[PDB]
Amino acid sequence: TPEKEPLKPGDILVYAQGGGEPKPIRLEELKPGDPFVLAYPMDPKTKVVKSGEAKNTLLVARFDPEELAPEVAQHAAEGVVAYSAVCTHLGCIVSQWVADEEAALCPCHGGVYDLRHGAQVIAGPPPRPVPQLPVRVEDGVLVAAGEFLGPVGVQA
Ligand code: FES
Ligand SMILES: [Mg+2]
Ligand SMILES: [Mg+2]
Ligand SMILES: [Mg+2]
């Protein structure tokens, strides 16, 4: 189904939504240092949000660009970073924030990913970082700028 299609470069990032019209994520809405938001990709011409496929679930956060690791900054936009939100341990959505680590926490078994430093696993059983999603800003809206930088979710 269109709603289960994979994320594609050029897709518009929208806030995770129930029904109703989607809301694109605008750069100016994200305050550097604030907790991440959960997002999905939306096909820019059909406006179909690809939220029926869990492996399209994203977390999106903004930091001061100087606080990002250079490798992360390569794929960031005005300090905004995005990653897959599917835990690489057993696939739970990495839905919680760790304020004093600026990290994403998985409530299932306590995986913690260090968002400014490439979602390095700093606690729990995730075997590898959630992959980064390159982003760019177009007319103030966040857009996927490439494929995920590695496989999503639970792998061999
Ligand atoms: S599914 Fe995330 S830590 Fe186990
Ligand atoms: Mg605002
Ligand atoms: Mg650092
Ligand atoms: Mg625990």
User: Any idea how long the chain is?
Assistant: 156
Q: Could you give the count of Cα atoms lying within 13 Å of 2 in the half-sphere of its Cβ?
A: 8
CA of 60 to the centre of ligand 1 (A): 19
Give the separation between CA 11 and CA 119, rounded to whole angstroms. 22
How many CB atoms within 10 Å of residue 38?
15
Q: What is the resolution of this structure in A?
A: 1.3
**In the chain, what are the domains?**
1-156 (2.102.10.10)
Residues at CB less than 6 angstroms from ligand 1: 87, 89-92, 106, 108-111, 124-126
Give the separation between CA 21 and CA 105, rounded to whole angstroms. 29
Of residues 34, 59, 66, the one with CA closest to residue 148: 59
Torsion of CA 57, 62, 67, 71, to 10 degrees: 40
In three state form, how does the secondary structure of the chain look? CHHHCCCCCCCEEEECCCCCCCCECEHHHCCCCCCCEEEEEECCCCCCECCCCHHHCEEEEECCHHHCCHHHHCCCECCEEEEECECCCCCCECCEEEHHHCEEECCCCCCEEEHHHCCEEEECCCCCCCCEECEEEECCEEEECCCCCCCCCCCC
Give the separation between CA 24 and CA 121, rounded to whole angstroms. 29
- Ligand 1 pocket test target in 83, 109, 152 with most atoms within 8 Å of CB: 109
